[PDB]
Design a protein around this ligand. Structure first.
Ligand code: MZ3
Lengths: 99, 99
């Protein structure tokens, strides 16, 4: 799809059999979801944004289907204000900016 | 142009006599620039992200040039680590996400 930006670029994602709304965020290096359970081992990590740093849980090699397109990669879980799909997965689904 | 997301989508913008480097950010509703002493009236505001909130100064109707495309809109000025081009200006320069 082509997506314009007069509205937030929110999309439905599928992760672990569950449907969620997430924001396509070219300003995010990483993919960060609100608090949820995912299987397998995680590592504690810290990420920084506009308001400072937070602690997250890092899950590697996680399948997410974003708007029909499959990715498998790193998903961070922690106190983000919103579910965000970052560049690590946007690249896997072939997402570019265009103007 | 077309911009891939292997690295941060940074581009040159112009505001007054300042050429700057800024992030094309589909996840930002608003445009947020690093501290700078713009002329004019402003209103105080709070914006939130990862880590929490920062205080900014909202300036209205500020011409900005983004990769040779002209825009004019609201700009928020405060202690962001990076210059952020938000949806309010990305729409003006014809910017879309495509995959
Ligand atoms: C009114 O609210 C806003 C207006 C403009 C920008 C922002 S923002 O905080 O910068 N933010 C909104 C968010 C959406 C979801 C989580 S945070 C935009 C987001 O793209 C910000 C932009 C940014 C980049 C670098 C340094 C600071 C900030 N990115 C990140 O927070 C970020 C950075 C690195 C990794 C990561 F996972 C994330 C989510 C908020």
């Amino acid at each position: 799809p082509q997506i314009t930006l007069w509205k937030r670029p929110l999309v439905t994602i599928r992760i672990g059999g569950q449907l969620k709304e997430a924001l396509l965020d070219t300003g995010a290096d990483d993919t960060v979801l609100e608090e949820m359970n995912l299987p397998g081992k995680w590592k504690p990590k810290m990420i920084g944004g506009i308001g400072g740093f937070i602690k997250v849980r890092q899950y590697d090699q996680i399948p997410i289907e974003i708007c029909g397109h499959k990715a498998i990669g790193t998903v961070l879980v922690g106190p983000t204000p919103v579910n965000i799909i970052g560049r690590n997965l946007l690249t896997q689904i072939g997402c570019t900016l265009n103007f």
